[PDB]
């Protein structure tokens, strides 16, 4: 029961950590997309200048 | 008296055996309760920290 109880807690940590990792991964993709759009504006603004 | 004395001696052996049997179970319970408490609480304290 000690290892079984501790195993359930360890498994729950993976699920809890996976939830935060999913949001972090999605935020990284969203932030990366904004960097691409910002880079295009810099090149377009610099080219227009 | 010999037969009656043996009954008391035999009964004492059963009572003495129960104390010895309970001592083995008591030591096993105390040794397991310390691990189940020191482990279930140590891991939980690390998660809160």
Inter-chain CB proximity A6 and B43 less than 8 Å: yes
B40: chain A residues, CB-CB within 8 Å: 2, 5-6
| Terminal-to-terminal C-alpha distance of chain B | 70
Inter-chain CB proximity B39 and A9 less than 8 Å: no
Resolution in A: 6.3
Whole-number Cα distances in Å, B22 to A46, B8, B9, B32, B36: 86, 21, 20, 15, 20
3-state secondary structure of A44: helix
Inter-chain CB proximity B40 and A2 less than 8 Å: yes
3-state secondary structure of B14: helix
């Amino acid at each position: 029961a000690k290892k079984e109880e501790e195993l359930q807690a360890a498994l729950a940590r993976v699920e809890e950590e996976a939830a935060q990792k999913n949001m972090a991964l999605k935020k990284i993709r969203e932030l990366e997309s904004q960097i691409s759009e910002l880079q295009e504006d810099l090149e377009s603004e610099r080219a227009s200048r | 008296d010999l037969n009656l004395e043996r009954s008391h001696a035999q009964k004492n052996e059963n009572a003495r055996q129960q104390l010895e049997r309970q001592n083995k179970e008591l030591k096993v319970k105390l040794q397991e309760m310390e691990g189940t408490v020191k482990s279930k609480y140590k891991a939980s304290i690390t998660a809160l920290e």
